Symmetry: C3
């Protein structure tokens, strides 16, 4: 019990040492602020995907964002933080050393400029953003109980390993040399490939909104799309700007890159839509392009020269705009918008990080990297591809397994089969289920949950 | 006129000393940021209580939140800050030493890590949040002029004394040893018991929405409930996280506790509703439970171990969920939602702080406390109860007096009696009052103020 | 290549020096946070002017705020930052030294407490707020392509010179001694006089909403007005609080002044409306008065004693409230709300800064000024008037030239003449333009762009 700084456990005895002395207070303030900013991205995701939908979802994703904030916070506390950021992990996962945040306090975190407790706060927001991306992707005819269980399991066995490989103290992707500045792999590529697994296993096939001569854009609520894009772009300054872990000017450089990629992505997607529609101005397109650029710059924001951030707007916006068209070749809508922006945007950004990463940008705050093709470090592109392939293999395969194992268990089935659920119009004709008469989630105090036509 | 640091008055002469040298700049930045975050809780309250209402209020609480931000800011400047945070107070109140913020500048505040001027900014937001809680509680058939006068008086003679006892330099509750980390007494218990006084003296009796077989949840606007809950949870990181007064990791520890209590409160209330309705998922319940947990953890966030923060979600959510049922036993709706979340949630949290407060949590930033039952400091629970009883006696009794003294004065009567006001439908039939035809506050440029049927 | 700190170029070689050593990290964190806060004012402007409109605009200003965020960010990167904040400017403009942010990194900025890259982030938000004020002012029957080109040109040749005179390293207004704390000239007076140029050249004359016995207030969406006012007041803490460039308590003093001016402006405008309507409570008026006070205090917030901030609420709210009446004398509505709040509010605030500026307020963080009439520095009022006259002459004249040169070019004409555009109801009857049937921007994926009746 000398209690001096150990770098392990709680970091020392608060009655004997001031744990705050190990950290620059301004670093801590910025990462605390950035945590608050990432938190508001959670309802941003909900608003965005609620608004863009071409189908009336029975579950309101604006409200489901709060449900996801609750489920993710509890999972992170319970063991999610420990599985990613315990200090004694393997190369593929952490441990249960910090179960229920036991001994999470003032030791320097995997990011040594902030203590464990603050790194826990910040990184837990990333877990929550990914949870609402997953709830958004799988929200069509979802049952709420099974969805909450799914999110808990999916965070534990899909998010946490991929996050560990990317960020953990011994993560194998970190060792390989792959670059991922703000977690494009664990957040965007991961949620995107998981969305794809949902689309192909549980999504509706031959979907009327994706079949024949149907509009590409047919939004539920433009004002929801816009409000979600506002919260997402506002919060993304914390998402990317805080991923330095410090108050250095690399944080602000990352913010300039973030803003410029969002801006160029928005204008690019709208310009592509203008060419492809023969002169129309796409309100949905401007918002999706801003998100495409934000996703695109996420792996790169603290590594690439400011002038290259425009390419992280332009190229993801172009490729994602055409990716959305694959919904019509497959005739599937469910889950595919999250796949198109986050999987395809995240893959493109991760790949381009291997091209444009620069050692002199990372060195703005002393961070040492070999760099990308900008430094003729040709091997970097293969490290990026190794990262993307690992994320895709794990996220798609394990998400498929979870969805299908729950589908075979009757009370955990996330989405009832079409032949077993009752119609809201016929439920409204029953007295013990009369509240389905109100099919508008603005005055209804109850979720219009799918009901098995066996009761 | 040597102007060196005195700790009194302006703190020194700006032409001779740098007043900023007394403070850690990172402490100041966090409390400045947290002030901005608490500010957005003001419209959060308005949105939440506007949306949850089972009655169409003529006054829009989203808009009334801005009115309350204006009235509270002026009252705080005029003498509210001085009555709580003057440096020469008694044990029950401050003074008028800082009338119109005279000499409020660079002396270390009652919280010595920030200067008076910044502490004034931060604490004034708490006064404003309490003002909109009070306007929300008393908004049914309120007359706007009288309401603005009421809020000014109520802040001066109810909020400011209770805040002084809790936070002031010589406040008697501080001396007793009562713990109240982020102002659960002055903000939540206070507004809650004042709401109760409104309910029992001015609220409608035998209210059709609270009588017989009526729905417990019947919201005006679910999207308003959700947007309000978003702003409240986002801002609460400043409300609780800033209540350390510093940039230490106790601030971030308080944020982790805040997030986990909100999350567990939301899931608990929804689970209780699911059991009590026989299988329904309550969209209103999830939001009210998040607020219950946020209120519950407010007195405790910087004092309790992280694993106990889940109890500050669970137990307030359970007890508050049943408290809302008392609206049906009394057959009163007006004011009772604010009472149920803030009085009952604040009382439960204050009580549980005496159980779970821990000296090693407070000591994260050097703060010295005897602790709670966690440290077998058994007397702490009685100090907490002394605090709650003082708040309840003062807030309920003095709020009752104000409401009844204004009720007896004809131009200050806050709520016209049912027999003396004219119906909006009959006002619409008069030309000098034709604008009451529009009973929807979305296109109407005028408040649909109650009009005495004597003109 | 010694790479030590030069104060020029990139500021030094990142491989040889730590550029962050030149700056207080807490200063950087506050200005980074304040940048994020100013960003959300961009959609705040859009919401406010969308909601207040007495006419149904075909272009949604909430959505157009994102378009403006994109166009302004790209212009700032391309050459806007360089034209204002290059380190080698003349007295009237900067240069293209920092084209595409070349060499923008760690040299101390024109504001020496933050590096170029962070000053670029922060000041670029001001450029974007001004862009959405301009898009709001000119939004009636705007064509989106021409508007985007107009904003790019207008930022380059109107905003950037005026910003340079106000803020640039050799700006002539700075040399004269004019005071403008947070950019009331470049943001508010500038956008306001440019709006006036739009009103008088492109606005509709003899407008039915401004002719005869018509309501002064007749809003499109009160909830939009309120949400915009919320985002604007929340973000204005960064707008004014960050304009110190540091973490000193002058930042927090500026925030107290900002809040009190907003509060007193809101209550004053509502009280004026109450007297002028004979007893009505104006929901629009409370919001416009808060904005009037925010605009009014912008040039003054870091220079005037706290008790005088109430005059920056009261007097702008009174004068602006009567200015709005000039819409009825001219019978023009288009562009005039932005003129009335930002030109008239900004002029009044700039003038009153010469009266109330105090050397002891500026000296809170070491800033040295002669002061205003408060210091019997009588000449200060003439320096303020010189500033306002220069802004008005440049903004009005050059904006007029741009609008008229584009008007004469057929594919750049911003607003089609009434005789050449087709009616949305007749477009809806054509198949290649059928989407004009939906005249509500909430479900329509396409901007209802004006179409020449020649195709």
């Amino acid at each position: 019990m000398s209690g001096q700084f150990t770098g392990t456990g709680t970091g020392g005895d608060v009655f004997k040492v001031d744990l705050n002395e190990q950290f620059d207070r301004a670093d801590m303030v910025w990462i605390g602020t950035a945590s608050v900013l990432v938190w508001i991205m959670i309802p941003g995701v909900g608003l965005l995907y609620s608004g863009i939908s071409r189908k009336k979802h029975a579950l309101s994703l604006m409200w489901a964002a709060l449900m996801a904030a609750c489920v993710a916070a509890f999972q992170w506390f319970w063991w999610g933080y420990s599985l990613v950021f315990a200090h004694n992990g393997s190369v593929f996962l952490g441990t249960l050393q910090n179960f229920c945040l036991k001994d999470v306090l003032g030791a320097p975190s995997i990011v040594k400029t902030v203590p464990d407790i603050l790194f826990c706060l910040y990184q837990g927001m990333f877990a929550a953003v990914t949870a609402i991306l997953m709830a958004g992707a799988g929200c069509e005819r979802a049952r709420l109980g099974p969805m909450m269980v799914f999110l808990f399991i999916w965070l534990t066995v899909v998010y946490c390993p991929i996050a560990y490989w990317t960020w953990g103290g011994n993560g194998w992707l970190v060792s390989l040399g792959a670059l991922d500045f703000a977690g494009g792999g664990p957040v965007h590529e991961n949620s995107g490939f998981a969305a794809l697994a949902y689309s192909l296993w549980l999504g509706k096939r031959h979907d009327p909104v994706a079949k024949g001569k149907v509009p590409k854009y047919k939004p539920h609520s433009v004002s929801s799309i816009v409000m979600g894009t506002i919260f997402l772009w506002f919060g993304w300054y914390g998402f990317n700007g805080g991923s330095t872990g410090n108050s250095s000017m690399r944080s602000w450089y990352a913010c300039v890159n973030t803003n410029l990629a969002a801006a160029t992505g928005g204008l690019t997607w709208m310009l592509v839509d203008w060419f492809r529609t023969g002169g129309k101005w796409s309100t949905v397109g401007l918002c999706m392009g801003a998100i495409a650029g934000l996703v695109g710059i996420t792996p790169a924001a603290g590594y690439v020269p400011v002038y290259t951030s425009v390419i992280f707007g332009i190229v993801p916006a172009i490729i994602c705009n055409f990716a959305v068209d694959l919904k019509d070749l497959l005739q599937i809508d469910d889950g595919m918008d999250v796949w198109a922006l986050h999987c395809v945007g995240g893959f493109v950004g991760n790949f381009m990080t291997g091209l444009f990463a620069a050692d002199y940008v990372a060195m703005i705050d002393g961070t040492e990297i070999d760099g990308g093709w900008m430094n003729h470090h040709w091997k970097q592109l293969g490290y990026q591809l190794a990262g993307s392939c690992a994320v895709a293999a794990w996220s798609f395969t394990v998400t498929s397994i979870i969805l299908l194992a729950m589908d075979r268990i009757p009370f955990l089935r996330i989405r009832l089969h079409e032949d077993e659920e009752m119609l809201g119009t016929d439920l409204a004709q029953i007295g013990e289920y009369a509240y389905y008469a109100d099919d508008d989630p603005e005055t209804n105090p109850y979720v219009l949950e799918p009901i098995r036509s066996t009761t």
